[model samples]
Target: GSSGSSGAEIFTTLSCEPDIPNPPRIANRTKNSLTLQWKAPSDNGSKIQNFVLEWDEGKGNGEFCQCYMGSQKQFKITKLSPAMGCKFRLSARNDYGTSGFSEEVLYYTSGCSGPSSG
Candidate 1:
């Protein structure tokens, strides 16, 4: 009969999503591999499950896909696009929901910028 009044009680436990993590940073850059560094976001009263990193190939061919975990602040993205370059975004997840995506950081590979071969 008073479920509406109890909404606040439930909401207190089911808090809002975590805050978006800080924008990712480039720890290292090379044609062979690229390194990324990031930080966690505010918990917003909920415990964050894990952090995620998404990347692209600069050509839009490689869509924004989940790439890495936040176990370590710094990690390398090897075996990825070579001369195509890359862009990265960092986000955090929690019991409530995702922290949404952060602003993207651009990186250029140390390879030929002329063109791609067949």
Candidate 2:
């Protein structure tokens, strides 16, 4: 025999979903726009492939806007109503499964004042 057995090839299968996404935060807030960012789960079951975002504009109904984002850490939403505040959350997903929703984040856009003199 010129070669020895390298042991049986083994593979691992993931049966559980990835951990929930971290809480989201806001930046670059304006009267009708804001930037959002979040952290991925400490332990990704297989690997974080994408993220799902759900948001509501304080409407009393069940209506909501959803978007799918790649493995980026940040996103931005525009054309929001100045009179209404927005609430949003995030969830992580992988080839194996989708994680639970993250903690909800609430942000209220503020009116921009006149241009600065400086």
Candidate 3:
């Protein structure tokens, strides 16, 4: 109440997944590396406690592999098998709880220009 603004304090509920979607787009995929980044969702409020990243190569046919979402907006994935097809998804987290998972995204790890090629 620093400015004498009167508002009720509301508590957000917990969910099993993440809320923020439209994850950061990635680019610059090489033979075995790629870069990724995304714009934070407008509803993300002031802070995003964390993010969860999961990915898998279609060849292995495994569930999404886990990667700890970092505190920054950008990350680079490397050591991927060249020219392999992979799928990825992400979720957002905060002090309240995790939000709904993001929509699934697919890509092929090729040394091409566009993300589709990566």
lDDT tens per residue, model 1, 3-117? 5543333533436777778897777767778877787776777778888878874566658877777666677877655675678888888777777788877787666657679
Candidate with more favorable, higher TM-score: 1 or 3: 1
Overall local distance difference test of candidate 2: 0.74
lDDT, residue 5, model 1: 44
**lDDT: worst 10-residue window of model 1:** 5-14
Clashing pairs in 1: none
Q: What's the true lDDT of residue 102 in model 3?
A: 76
Clash pairs for candidate 2:
none
Q: How large is the C-alpha RMSD of every model relative to the true structure?
A: 10.4, 11.6, 8.8
- Ranking of all candidate structures by their lDDT, best first: 2, 1, 3
Residue 92, model 2: Cα distance from true site in angstroms: 0.3
Task: Give per-model TM-scores.
Answer: 0.71, 0.72, 0.68
Candidate 3 local lDDT, 10-44, one digit each (tens): 87954433356675576677678867776565444
Model 3: runs farther than 4 Å from truth? 1-18, 44-46, 57-62, 111-118
Assess each prediction's global lDDT (C-alpha) against the native: 0.74, 0.74, 0.68
Q: Write the per-residue lDDT of candidate 2 for residues 1-118, one digit (tens) a residue.
A: 5977677667785567887877788767767777888877856457677888887755646556775467777887777666467788898887776788887777777764587799
